[PDB]
Amino acid sequence: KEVLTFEPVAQDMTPIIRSALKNVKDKDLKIVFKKGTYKFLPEYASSEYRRITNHGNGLKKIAFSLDGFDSVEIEGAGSEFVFHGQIAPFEFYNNKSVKVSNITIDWDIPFTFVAEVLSVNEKLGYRDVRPVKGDHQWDLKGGKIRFPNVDGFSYNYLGSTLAWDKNEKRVVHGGIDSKSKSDDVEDLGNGVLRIHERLKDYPPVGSLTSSKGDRETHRYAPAFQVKNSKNIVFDNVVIHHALGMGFLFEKSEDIQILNSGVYLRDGSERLISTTADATHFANCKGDILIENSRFENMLNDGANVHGTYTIVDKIIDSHTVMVKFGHFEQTGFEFTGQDDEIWFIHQPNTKRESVNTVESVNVINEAYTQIKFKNRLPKQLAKGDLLENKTWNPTFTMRKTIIKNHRARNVVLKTPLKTVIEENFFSSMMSSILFRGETFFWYESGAVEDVLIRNNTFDYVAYAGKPHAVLNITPRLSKSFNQDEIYDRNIRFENNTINSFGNRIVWADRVGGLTVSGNTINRNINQPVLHPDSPLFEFVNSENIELKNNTYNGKVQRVLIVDDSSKGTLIDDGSIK
Template identity: 60%
Template sequence: MNKNLIIAVSCFVIALSMFNANATTVIRLSPSADDMTPVLVKALQGTTDKDIKIIFEKGEYRFLADYAMERYTTVTNHDNGLKKVIFALDGYNSVEIEGNGANFIFHGRVAPFQVFNSQNITIKNLSIDWDIPFTFLAEIMAVNEKEGWRDVKPRNGSHQWALKNGKITFPNVDGFTFTELGSSLPWEADIKRVSLGAIDLKSRPTHVEKLDNGLLRIYEKLDSYPPVGSLFSSKGDRNVHRYAPAFHMKNAKNVEMSNVVVHHALGMGFLFERTEDIALRKVGVYLSEGSDRVISTIADATHFANCKGHVLIEDSRFENMLDDGTNLRGTYVMVDEVINDKTLRFKFGHFEQLGYEFAAPGDEVWLIQQPNTERQQVNIISKVNVINEEYSELTFEQTLPKNLQKGDLIENKTWYPSFTMRGTTIKNNRARNVVIKTPLKTVIEDNYFSSMMASILFRGESYFWFEAGAVGDVLIQNNHFEYNSYYGGEQAVLYITPRLGKVFNQKQLYDQNIRFINNKIDTHGGRIVWADRVDGIVVENNSIERSIHRAQLFPDAPVFEFKNSQNVTLKNNRYIGDYNVAVVVDKTSGETLKDDGSIK
């Protein structure tokens, strides 16, 4: 039996249909020049159904913060706190959002989408942007390194800034402003990519003055000054410049997103925490056509923290973000105290992981006891007692090792996904193209990558970020790498570099079973593969050409280098152009090296 109830509210219609006792609320929205936030909030509050479908007519929609729902939110790798949430979607059996090509424009400090404790989520055919970006951008007109100043011509357009009491403030939206320029980088103006040899800097000028010609003179002693003609972009104070991702999903399941584009966000583009089975097809993080900006998202384009099932990224495009294209990882937490033979207290290591849901009853975890970096005893959690955002207690089904001690690590075995990325372009961003940390099957194929740092990075780390863990089955094939590792610090196209604290064995094998085959690499010189502590890596049938005429920053760097590794195979690789050193291996790596000498 079908029953239809249509309710007209302002500029939208809610259609409620029932079929076999399962109700689905359908919300239809039309474009409006007015603030759509109260309209949407009222519509969502008007239903108790567990299945919801929101349909937008094609057009532009503006969302302001004034009437957004406010709630305290913990957001991994962002700033915890009160968030103004536009789409607050919690506890649904199904969520479908059809954009029909709609463009959402957000204003101020808002979290556009939070989808928590829900499943069967489909979002498609929409784009999001901000009217005023949360960055400052200026052209470098002159530099005086001796006197310690640079003259800049600020970009206006959609950017918003002011000079007050000798300081640049931005974006000055709804009472919010950054207190310093903060994290900054120079960009090549024509291509909108980070300048060759650039390094991250924290810009804290001593004084800024306005010149007669309308330029600003910024007084600040720097170790490295941006090139004249470059665009200098700043994103503000580190402790507040990651407000929220555009899309944040937590404790979700069965996510499908397609033709969804993020042009700007006050954090990451797409963030998933403890989410199972995710497919991103034809999604994007990149600048809108004709944009006067150089920055898309403030942080990663996509980030997957302790997810499981399978994660797929296909036929997508990520550009101009201020961190990685994709970061997929687990989490290490530290043993703080062993309370009894089945209970311990742990502590989060990084300030942006506080309040993170690390584990739940029924999860399997690995215990990693220093100095051994191997995943050791497996135990099952029977109870979790959250003390506060920094500390929690775990009770286990089986007895804990008697020698477990403070500083040992815990890694969640249950919440790791397999991963596939194919047909995707990632370029012109700060940091890496892809960062992967999962022991399950990983396939990276048929992509185009260009990145200022390493293009593909494997780095489990037991300090600072505390991002786990070691990879165990990786195939990297048929990709095109072009102009990588142009950062001011030495990197490689494929960079494998565990970062484990001093209490752990610095020579013990960590990552394993990596195949880097049939890839095309266009380079300006430098390292192609740089690996430490790998057990089993095959570098085969790759075509490398020094076809990019830019300065090589580290001319003595070898093409391939291996340290503390075993079972390394180099076979049928080709190099066109000049290089100084082909292969460097230490004694340990050389004992099992198989090198056919195709690059020598």
């Protein structure tokens, strides 16, 4: 077992880490840093081609690459790691044990463009903004905004854009995603720019506008990428910035995120923490635990545990099938391997039909995968059918965690195993707890079968411009399948406290078995209703839904909209009338 210790010696700690890690020999490694501020530039960092799920594949500059260890541990001892430019901070590949603790990750210059809106003129089609200085970087060239101008990199445009409250640093009431692609930006002095373009929906005056950049290149790498690893623990790990997601896990087992978080540094002038999901679990298995954590100010979901839906392309023989990935950012994923159990899904039935076990895998390219099974393939297997990995599905538990003030759903649950969401504080612009089985555009599996959401606090939920709800069960499946079959099952929403401004509470679609009990709804938020006459609960094409011992306080609101199919099995004790 080797133990490497480091001090803040040089202004760029990348070459020292690269050389020390390159000469490691044993399979048990521990790295200790004396508490200080370490800076890492990508200029002299190692470069490898990487396949990153829900990110863009390509050549990556990597600061910490740890591959093949029996156990690897990184002790930061409260150190702060400052990164620069387009770089991947940490990569943990093929490790039977991973532990990172007591560390803070940030960038010297963030890859965002934040500006305060001064005035908006919809008639002429321009907006006057004052960019926040802080540690942001930007300039003008060719009548176009260039940012962040780090190591010669700059996005073509501001890209997708959102309005934020300057005081609370959260998405504004009724805020929606803007897309800024302006070609004419003027400098009026005063540190004020006039951006010429006719937006569909303009940001409010006084709000702060966030911009991540071009959609094609802003997902460079997550702060942490864990691939094919087991027994991973993150303890007291804070992420202030990342050119992508915060914690990304691919095909891993027994993951723990404790006392960690992704949020803004207090006293700073930053608006966004991570440009993508805070935590992400793609086809993991074993157990996943998130406890005593805090995720805010991300540009995407707080958590998404899900698997991959692959599409049958061709039948090779009686035991071999070739599948294709559905989403462009899913190509290169390690879908399956030997001894994996796989669910077969035949059009137009959305349910898991049969199970088979993989014998071998022949990867043709990043898009197509040839799978040979131990048993005979289903006789009805045809092109367009789906494969879902049965082995790689985790149990999920999120408790005593804070998720607020960011642009997405709070928690997205797509695992068929036992899921427990308890004792959390939640606040979401969009839906808070979302279920979206997707075979239309994202191809993310996870029809659920055991989910429990109890004793949580929901405050200021679903204040986006588009309609949402605290608990939103809305699968989006390909039209090659029937659109009225039961998809999700056995979801319980118990003993929660919802502070409402007039938002939907529960919107269920194709749920089989849904218990909404013991909840207290408090109409105590002084915010205007964005979708008038929206009911607390709406159910469509569902079965065996039960309302029981719920309480509503405040101004009256429409209670229930239900289709004739789910009404035949709905149990309503009239606790809210």
